[PDB]
């Protein structure tokens, strides 16, 4: 078969995790849900209660 | 083999080689790694660059 699967992009902000040995393996886009924006605000992937 | 050297009104297209300095490590010295200026101690570590 044949599939292009082309998708556009928009300027947004991202919170990139920088693990050792030069890898990412996890990211969060702070434009989809308020939980992602909260994660990007305090710079943490595990948010406590409050 | 005749090498015709010219110095006409034109930008510097051909120049001589750019000899780099030695690597002075374990000493607070000035460093210039192609624009990166400043002063620091050149010491290795156990990081993994890409």
């Amino acid at each position: 078969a044949a599939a292009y699967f082309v998708g556009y992009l928009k300027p947004t902000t991202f919170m990139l995790k920088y693990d050792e040995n030069g890898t990412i393996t996890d990211a969060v886009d702070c434009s989809q849900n308020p939980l992602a924006e909260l994660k990007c605000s305090v710079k943490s992937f595990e948010i406590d209660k409050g | 083999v005749v090498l015709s050297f010219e110095l006409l009104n034109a930008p510097a297209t051909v120049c001589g080689p750019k000899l780099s300095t030695d690597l002075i490590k374990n000493q607070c010295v000035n460093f210039n790694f192609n624009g990166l200026t400043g002063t620091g101690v050149l010491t290795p570590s156990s990081k993994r660059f890409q």
């Binding site: 998708g7 992009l9 991202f14 990139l16 920088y18 050792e20 990412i24 | 990081k47 890409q50």
Partner: peptide
């Protein structure tokens, strides 16, 4: 038609620690 956490590329060539 859904990019489930896809399209994350290195924005620069800078190595960063944890």
């Amino acid at each position: 038609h859904t990019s489930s956490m896809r399209g994350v590329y290195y924005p620069d060539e800078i190595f960063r620690s944890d």
